[PDB]
Amino acid sequence: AQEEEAEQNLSELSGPWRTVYIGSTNPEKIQENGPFRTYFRELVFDDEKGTVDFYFSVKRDGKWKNVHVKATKQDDGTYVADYEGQNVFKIVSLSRTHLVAHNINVDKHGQTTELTELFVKLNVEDEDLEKFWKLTEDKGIDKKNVVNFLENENHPHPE
Amino acid sequence: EEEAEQNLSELSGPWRTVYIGSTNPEKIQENGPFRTYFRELVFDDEKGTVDFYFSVKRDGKWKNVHVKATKQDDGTYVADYEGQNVFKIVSLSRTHLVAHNINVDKHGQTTELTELFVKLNVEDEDLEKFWKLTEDKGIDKKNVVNFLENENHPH
Numbered sequence: 001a002q003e004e005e006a007e008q009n010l011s012e013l014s015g016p017w018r019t020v021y022i023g024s025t026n027p028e029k030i031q032e033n034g035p036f037r038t039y040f041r042e043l044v045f046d047d048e049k050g051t052v053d054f055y056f057s058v059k060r061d062g063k064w065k066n067v068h069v070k071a072t073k074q075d076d077g078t079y080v081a082d083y084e085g086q087n088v089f090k091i092v093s094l095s096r097t098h099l100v101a102h103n104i105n106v107d108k109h110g111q112t113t114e115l116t117e118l119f120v121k122l123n124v125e126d127e128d129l130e131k132f133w134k135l136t137e138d139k140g141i142d143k144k145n146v147v148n149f150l151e152n153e154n155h156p157h158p159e
Numbered sequence: 160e161e162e163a164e165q166n167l168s169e170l171s172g173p174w175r176t177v178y179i180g181s182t183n184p185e186k187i188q189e190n191g192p193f194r195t196y197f198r199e200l201v202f203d204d205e206k207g208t209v210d211f212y213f214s215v216k217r218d219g220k221w222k223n224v225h226v227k228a229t230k231q232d233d234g235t236y237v238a239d240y241e242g243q244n245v246f247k248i249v250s251l252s253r254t255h256l257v258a259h260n261i262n263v264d265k266h267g268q269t270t271e272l273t274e275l276f277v278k279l280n281v282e283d284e285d286l287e288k289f290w291k292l293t294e295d296k297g298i299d300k301k302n303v304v305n306f307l308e309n310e311n312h313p314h
């Protein structure tokens with residue numbers, strides 16, 4: 001017998017995520033305009049399908065693009081996904097607060113690059129949303145006159 | 160296992176805006192001066208102040224703004240930004256900030272806004288784990304980009 005099945009419950013982890021650090025064996029890949037200079041926006045874990053959907057922004061030729069990539073868990077435990085080539089990636093450490101992964105990318109030229117990354121979750125608690133809503137009610141503000149900044153078609157550019 | 164000491168200044172660092180509500184919708188609509196995307200906050204216990212670092216789009220262009228708020232003996236804060244402001248922190252932890260602000264603009268108009276902000280905490284253990292992983296893969300520290308500081312210092 002090899003290893004045994006892993007009880008996986010990461011659904012709890014879906015939500016807003018941000019990129020802290022991304023390291024690379026090939027710096028050109030992460031330098032400005034690089035394909036893996038990805039600013040995470042959201043992550044969605046599905047335990048039924050055993051998938052991870054990545055939502056992130058990347059600048060391509062002085063222009064910002066919002067990308068969506070779906071990764072699928074393999075019986076190996078790793079995940080594979082198509083983005084600027086082929087990737088096999090591995091969650092080395094994941095918790096409600098963080099995420100450290102190792103990705104191996106093979107581009108359209110067969111060039112292999114190993115990347116490392118630290119990502120953090122933007123945790124918005126219920127106890128706090130309530131407190132903000134109450135206050136907002138008290139001050140007589142209308143829910144319609146409130147702007148959601150954690151998801152809007154008009155935000156700042158990291159560069 | 161291990162947690163840093165609790166300090167006000169220790170809450171200093173990257174913060175992000177979640178929601179902001181207003182009595183005058185024009186203040187937080189596109190191009191409104193209060194449609195502020197927080198980048199960082201620095202609490203200073205000695206001077207009794209809070210420094211706001213945020214971004215706001217004006218005349219179609221994103222601008223980086225810094226505002227120094229000063230605590231009052233009564234615990235609230237004053238700050239000059241698009242008129243005079245009297246800021247009140249209704250709840251604050253290492254995780255969140257809920258606050259009420261009253262702004263009177265240069266023309267004497269009064270707007271009351273509410274806001275919910277959240278902090279981006281990057282824990283030591285996770286940082287070291289990223290670097291350990293990074294050196295295990297033979298990646299040189301000079302070959303790593305700090306995305307968080309870029310986000311905190313856009314343009």
Ligand SMILES: CCCCCCCCCCC=O
Pocket residue numbers: 022036038054056069071081082083087089101102103115116117
């Ligand atoms: C790269 C962003 C998402 C699509 C490609 C598969 C791996 C991403 C993991 C993050 C990069 O280290």
Ligand SMILES: CCCCCCCCCCC=O
Pocket residue numbers: 193195211226228237238240243244245246258259260261262272273274
């Ligand atoms: C409103 C100004 C008073 C102090 C800080 C103002 C800038 C951010 C708006 C605060 C809302 O909570």
